[PDB]
Amino acid sequence: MGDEEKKEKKKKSKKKSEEEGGDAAPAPPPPKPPSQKRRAQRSGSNVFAMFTQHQVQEFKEAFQLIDQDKDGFISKNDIRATFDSLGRLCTEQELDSMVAEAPGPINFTMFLTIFGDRIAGTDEEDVIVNAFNLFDEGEGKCKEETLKRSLTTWGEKFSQDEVEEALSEAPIDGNGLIDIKKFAQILTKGAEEEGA
Amino acid sequence: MGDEEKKEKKKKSKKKSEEEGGDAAPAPPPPKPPSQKRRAQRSGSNVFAMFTQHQVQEFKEAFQLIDQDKDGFISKNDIRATFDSLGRLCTEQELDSMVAEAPGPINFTMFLTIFGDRIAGTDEEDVIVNAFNLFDEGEGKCKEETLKRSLTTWGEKFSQDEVEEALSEAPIDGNGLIDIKKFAQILTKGAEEEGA
Amino acid sequence: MADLKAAEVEKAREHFEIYDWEGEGKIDARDLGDLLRSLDCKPTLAMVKKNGGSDKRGEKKLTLEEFLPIFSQIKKEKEVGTLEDFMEGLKVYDKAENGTMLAAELAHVLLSLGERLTDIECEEIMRVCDEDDDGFLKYEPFVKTIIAGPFPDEGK
Amino acid sequence: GKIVTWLQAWIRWYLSKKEFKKLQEQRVALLVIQRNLRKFLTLRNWLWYKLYIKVKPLLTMAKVEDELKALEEKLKKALESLEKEEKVRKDIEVQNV
Amino acid sequence: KGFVDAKKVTEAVLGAIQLDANDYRLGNTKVFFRAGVLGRLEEMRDDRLGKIVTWLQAWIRWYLSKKEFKKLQEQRVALLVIQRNLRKFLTLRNWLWYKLYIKVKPLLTMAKVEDELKALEEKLKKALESLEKEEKVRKDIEVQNV
């Protein structure tokens, strides 16, 4: 008994995070018992409802540019096809990790819990943004030279390559590194190019 | 190795556009070193009110009632029954031409995509509605004599028949038109039974 | 020599298309004036009558091929009227040099002298500017506005 | 005596390039109407478009909209007053004392 | 012991840290002191005023701190994850969620419905229930102002 639920929730769990460490060396992945879903409950989430009147309408408007099974599906083979044109490189090292949030039948019922997983993802907002944000006492920005210091010192001493790519890429709004937007460019409401 | 991606996408095509009507041909990017396919984007989208909120959606969900015998593939008879449930029908030939507007099998793939590109014809609501608004001196009511004097003369000369026909149905509050309401008599939620 | 740059050509055009209602590729010798205004020049009617433009619609139409020469001409001219030529003018209309001139007096004069205004252009300029519960139109900030133009920072 | 053509022509200048907004906007307004009065007439007998109210509102979608138009009005103005009010009494109470 | 006189309480709460007799004086609202004697015996009352005075303040410290310590709290969990990104910075900018979600949102009418529909009634009622009290007071006191 339970066997069959977990046949499904092998393919649906998976979903955080059996095969995570693809490029970078592995680290203790999420465990397999059906109770452990309560630690899959970490922070980062928000919950919605099934109906949409004319709000998520947008998907019927967007559909034509992207589609796979026009019944209503995006399935395991379509990540290897459409995402090429939406964003990042995929490797055979990171496959189901790059798919980690949605590894199988994302039906109309299931689309909601990938959209909640926008506000969840890999440690969204609450972690991703608040991380550097928590440094300062008021309306800050992260103190650049001390960020250089900790990167060559604190526990795992990094390497020079990463730093020089980062330097040319540093969004220094006036005398401190604007990490908050270096992360939050991907949310806000104020452009429309890519991702999808 | 560096292969299991590009192998697997050859599925995508089988339930979408490719077989059903390859006008819109795709383009597969990736070279043998996969990190170089990242210049293959889909960038830029929302012009105006493309799939208009009161028109587009309530059609795709309706499909189960148009798809009569429940295959996905609307024959000329699935049409023939459903219009008999509505009220007025076109003849076989009149529907046969709508079939000829599409590449053939009006199915859940085909119907939706033959809808999907067709956005030109009508004008968006604001645009029609603003016409006597950008004409009154500063908000009173616009005189039906000026309208009658314009349509006849200053531009494409409408006929005696064309003019007074379109005139008649007019909420004429005392020599001036209730412009926005007659604009609503031109475009609003209203007259069925016309397709599909 | 002095000429008209590419930017000057486009601005004249962007308006001209909108001005020629009919599509004759041509404006009227009255539109010759309000075009120069819209283009952000400021000539008198008498300047337009110094160069061959009119009161009435229906005599001679002009192409852009006549307009752009005349625009090159206007661009050369100095006798338009500065702040100084106005700060002169105002200093009899203060009855005791303060800035603060009487509205009713400003009305009687503008209708009589200079070019002469219409009823409307009087009532509209007063209603457009600072009338307080006394009636004191402050002549120099008023002139500074006329120098500035139709749109400050309120989109109104 | 010669007060003052120049300043009177400067009046006319900023006066005119302002009111001209209406003459521009109206030119395209004349166009949108002159096509639609004819669109309305021909496209009243097309093959795929004016399916709208006769059987389609067995569905949802339209359903709530117009009600909420009349209701949402109320939600806004109650909130707007609830913002402004207290902080008016702040500067009234400041006076009273 | 419960509650004591308005006046008779002050001479023990003076005379506790002695306080030289001449160099203080009782009055009715105003209290009178000399120079010298007062001030440093009034600094000394920080070193001496333990128990209730510092326990009101300390309870307010615990009041404040129980609600508002913040800062260090979510830091550790975020900080480990910063590392989980930092080991991969050369990849990071090449990602998925960026901007395709936006421009239509000013054009559509009644956007965030359902959840705000569950909120709707309470939002309607309590804003009015408040605008009832959040009028009437200043609002009547206008007449009283005049």
The answer to whether the CB atoms of E100 and A194 lie below 8 A apart is: yes
Taking Cα atoms as reference points, which of C31, C97, C95 lies closest to residue C66?
A: C31
Tokens of A143: 């103190």
| Three-class secondary structure of residue C103 per DSSP | helix
Q: What is the distance in angstroms between the CA of the first residue and the CA of the last residue of chain E?
A: 48
The answer to whether the CB atoms of D60 and A54 lie below 8 A apart is: no
Calculate the CA A180 to chain-centre distance: 17
Neighbours of A195 (CB within 10 A): 18
Tokens of E123: 């939002």
Rounded Cα distance, D3 and C86, in Å: 9
Inter-CA distances, C140 with C93, C116, C143, Å? 12, 20, 5
Q: Which residues of A touch D67 (CB under 8 A)?
A: none
For residue B172, count CB atoms less than 10 angstroms from its CB and return exposed for 0-12, middle for 13-18, buried for 19 or more: middle
Say yes or no: E103 contacts chain B, CB-CB below 8 A: yes
Tokens of E96: 């998925």
Contact call for C and A: 3+ CB–CB distances under 8 Å? no
Decide the pairing of beta strands C61-63 and C26-28. antiparallel
Nearest-by-CA chain D residue for A54: D61
Phi/psi of residue E56, nearest 5 degrees: -70, -55
Tokens of C71: 């625009």
β-sheet bridge partners, residue C73: none
In angstroms, the separation between the Cα of residue A45 and the nearest Cα of chain D is 27
The DSSP 8-state label assigned to residue A177 in this structure reads B
C-beta of residue C139 within 8 angstroms of C-beta of residue C95: no
Chains that touch D (3 or more CB pairs under 8 A): A, B, C, E
Chains that touch B (3 or more CB pairs under 8 A): A, D, E
Rounded Cα distance, E91 and E94, in Å: 6
β-sheet bridge partners, residue A69: A73
Please name the member of D1, D7, D18 whose beta carbon is closest to the beta carbon of C150. Answer: D18
Chains that touch C (3 or more CB pairs under 8 A): D
Inter-CA distances, A181 with A122, A166, A178, B157, Å? 18, 15, 6, 58
C-beta of residue B164 within 8 angstroms of C-beta of residue D50: no
Query: Solved by what technique?
Result: cryo-EM
Rounded Cα distance, B157 and D92, in Å: 64
Say yes or no: B62 contacts chain D, CB-CB below 8 A: yes
**Sequence-distant (≥ 6) Cβ neighbours of residue E37 within 8 angstroms:** E19, E20, E23, E24
Rounded Cα distance, E14 and B140, in Å: 82
Tokens of A109: 């019922």
Pairs of CB atoms within 8 A across A/B: 91
Rounded Cα distance, C149 and B105, in Å: 64
The DSSP 8-state label assigned to residue B139 in this structure reads S
Rg (CA), chain B: 24
Rounded Cα distance, C42 and C52, in Å: 16
Virtual CA dihedral for B134, B137, B141, B142, nearest 10 degrees? Answer: -70
**Which of E116, E134, E142, E143 is best to mutate for the D interface (most D CBs within 10 A)?**
E134
Pairs of CB atoms within 8 A across A/E: 101
Nearest-by-CA chain E residue for B126: E107
The answer to whether the CB atoms of B50 and A61 lie below 8 A apart is: yes
Calculate the CA C56 to chain-centre distance: 18
Q: What is the distance in angstroms between the CA of the first residue and the CA of the last residue of chain B?
A: 49
Q: DSSP secondary structure string, C48-97?
A: HHHHT--SSSSS-EEEHHHHHHHHHHHHH--TT--HHHHHHHHTTTSSSS
**Sequence-distant (≥ 6) Cβ neighbours of residue D69 within 8 angstroms:** none
Residues of chain A with a CB closer than 8 angstroms to some CB in chain B? 54, 57, 60-61, 63-65, 67-71, 73, 76-78, 80-82, 84-92, 95, 192-194, 196
Tokens of E90: 């050369």
Rounded Cα distance, B28 and B30, in Å: 7
The answer to whether the CB atoms of B127 and D32 lie below 8 A apart is: yes
The DSSP 8-state label assigned to residue E132 in this structure reads H
Q: Which of residues 120-179 of A touch E (CB under 8 A)?
A: 121, 123, 126-128, 130-132, 134, 151, 155-156, 158, 161-162, 165-166, 169
| Three-class secondary structure of residue C1 per DSSP | coil
Q: What is the resolution of this structure in A?
A: 20.0
Q: DSSP secondary structure string, E40-56?
A: HHTTHHHHH--HHHHHH
Going A60 to A63 to A64 to A67, the CA torsion angle's sign is: negative
**Sequence-distant (≥ 6) Cβ neighbours of residue B64 within 8 angstroms:** B70
Taking Cα atoms as reference points, which of C116, C146, C120, C142 lies closest to residue C129?
A: C142
Rounded Cα distance, C65 and C25, in Å: 10
The answer to whether the CB atoms of D89 and E137 lie below 8 A apart is: yes
Rounded Cα distance, C2 and B24, in Å: 55
In angstroms, the separation between the Cα of residue D52 and the nearest Cα of chain A is 16
Rg (CA), chain D: 28
Going E140 to E142 to E144 to E146, the CA torsion angle's sign is: negative
In the Cβ-directed half-sphere of E131, how many Cα atoms lie within 13 Å? 17
Inter-CA distances, C61 with C27, C32, C40, C64, C65, Å? 6, 9, 22, 10, 11
Rounded Cα distance, A40 and D17, in Å: 65
Nearest-by-CA chain B residue for D45: B194
- Strand ranges of the sheet holding B176-177, from the earlier edge strand across to the other edge: B142-143, B176-177, B172-173
